[PDB]
Amino acid sequence: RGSFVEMVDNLRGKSGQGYYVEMTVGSPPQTLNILVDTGSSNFAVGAAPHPFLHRYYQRQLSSTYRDLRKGVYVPYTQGAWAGELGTDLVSIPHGPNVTVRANIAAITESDKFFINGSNWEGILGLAYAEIARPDDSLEPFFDSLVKQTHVPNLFSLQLCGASVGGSMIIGGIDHSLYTGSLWYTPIRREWYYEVIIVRVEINGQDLKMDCKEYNYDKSIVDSGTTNLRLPKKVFEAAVKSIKAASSTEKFPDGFWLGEQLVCWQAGTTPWNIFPVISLYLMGEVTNQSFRITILPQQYLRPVESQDDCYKFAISQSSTGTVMGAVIMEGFYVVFDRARKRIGFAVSACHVHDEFRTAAVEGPFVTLDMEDCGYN
Numbered sequence: 001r002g003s004f005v006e007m008v009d010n011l012r013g014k015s016g017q018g019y020y021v022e023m024t025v026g027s028p029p030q031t032l033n034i035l036v037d038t039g040s041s042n043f044a045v046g047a048a049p050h051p052f053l054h055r056y057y058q059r060q061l062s063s064t065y066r067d068l069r070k071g072v073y074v075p076y077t078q079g080a081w082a083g084e085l086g087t088d089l090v091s092i093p094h095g096p097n098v099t100v101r102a103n104i105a106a107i108t109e110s111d112k113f114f115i116n117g118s119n120w121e122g123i124l125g126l127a128y129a130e131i132a133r134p135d136d137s138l139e140p141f142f143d144s145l146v147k148q149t150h151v152p153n154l155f156s157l158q159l160c161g162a163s164v165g166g167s168m169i170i171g172g173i174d175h176s177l178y179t180g181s182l183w184y185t186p187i188r189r190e191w192y193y194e195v196i197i198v199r200v201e202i203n204g205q206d207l208k209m210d211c212k213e214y215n216y217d218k219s220i221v222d223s224g225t226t227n228l229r230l231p232k233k234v235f236e237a238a239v240k241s242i243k244a245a246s247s248t249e250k251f252p253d254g255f256w257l258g259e260q261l262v263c264w265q266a267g268t269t270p271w272n273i274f275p276v277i278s279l280y281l282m283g284e285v286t287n288q289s290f291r292i293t294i295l296p297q298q299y300l301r302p303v304e305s306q307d308d309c310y311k312f313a314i315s316q317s318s319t320g321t322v323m324g325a326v327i328m329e330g331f332y333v334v335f336d337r338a339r340k341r342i343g344f345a346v347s348a349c350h351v352h353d354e355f356r357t358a359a360v361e362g363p364f365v366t367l368d369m370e371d372c373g374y375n
């Protein structure tokens, strides 16, 4: 047992519909399951009945609730909600041993946001103030945590894929959650968790595109997004290469577009016929990079008997690269805000087989990496 042991295994997920942590709000206590989202910056909770919600926040029952008397609307790439701003006392029972007064958006209405059977009732936006709604004056939860307490300005995520689980370690790192070394990439700018991808490989074969393409118009680490999302040009090249590498079997075009599922008899999935995928990220030293490598076990996601049905979970984007659960489920990911960097190591819980494993390797030599970023 390490010092952060009480924060280990503090995440859950139902049928692969998002990773959530328990958060306790108000006085007396109201505990709710809250989606961990590194892709946004608002802390918001269901605050009225909804067909997909088992519980919700009841502000009338919280003595410590303070109304900010201001509405808020947050649209995501998927779904949207509207609500009312306030502040209240917040603790994470399997998180840090502190209690803070944080901004909280009470969700009163929503569209395609909550997910049937997911078992979560709110969202914890862990990114920076720049992308907070209504604006950057609304202090995000982690900012309040760091300002009000002595909790170090760092958190880390281990998302364990396939009911699923994992760990959110707040204020530090737990060594039981990874193997090998942690490799760090700079946070390019503090808004989203923006990174820079400098090279892409399918089964070790370079995709051979300008690195500007991989980061057009940004690349982000986003635990709230299921897929590995890629800019259109990059997605097209990637799929063409993955098909070529997996050519012993043929699949319909709709499979590669995520519109069609393919199922195998329970336990017989031919993982071996599908390629590994590597992303190279800018390192902490000049002209130095490293690479992270995922398996089909990460990018082919299981979907709801004696058949294992899978969705191809790499998809196209018009708003830059999104390194979502498909990436994060291979790795222990350290969000080192204090040092403006993100670390990756091989996850102790990542799904693999007897022939291949997810990997984090380096260093590599990559020139002109500062040119890869969109301006």
Ligand SMILES: CC(C)CNC(=O)[C@H](C)NC[C@H](Cc1ccccc1)NC(=O)c1cc(C(=O)N[C@H](C)c2ccc(F)cc2)cc(N(C)S(C)(=O)=O)c1
Binding pocket: 016, 017, 018, 019, 035, 037, 039, 040, 041, 074, 075, 076, 077, 078, 079, 112, 113, 114, 123, 131, 133, 222, 223, 224, 225, 226, 227, 229, 315, 324, 325
């Ligand atoms: C700055 C902000 C105003 C906006 N920020 C964003 O929209 C960023 C880019 N994404 C975070 C935003 C947060 C969110 C939306 C809706 C429900 C739950 C969470 N995510 C998406 O836009 C999004 C979600 C999802 C999603 O289904 N998420 C669930 C909860 C999930 C997460 C992790 C898992 F391992 C499994 C399931 C999917 C997408 N895609 C567009 S997709 C299909 O993965 O490519 C996009």
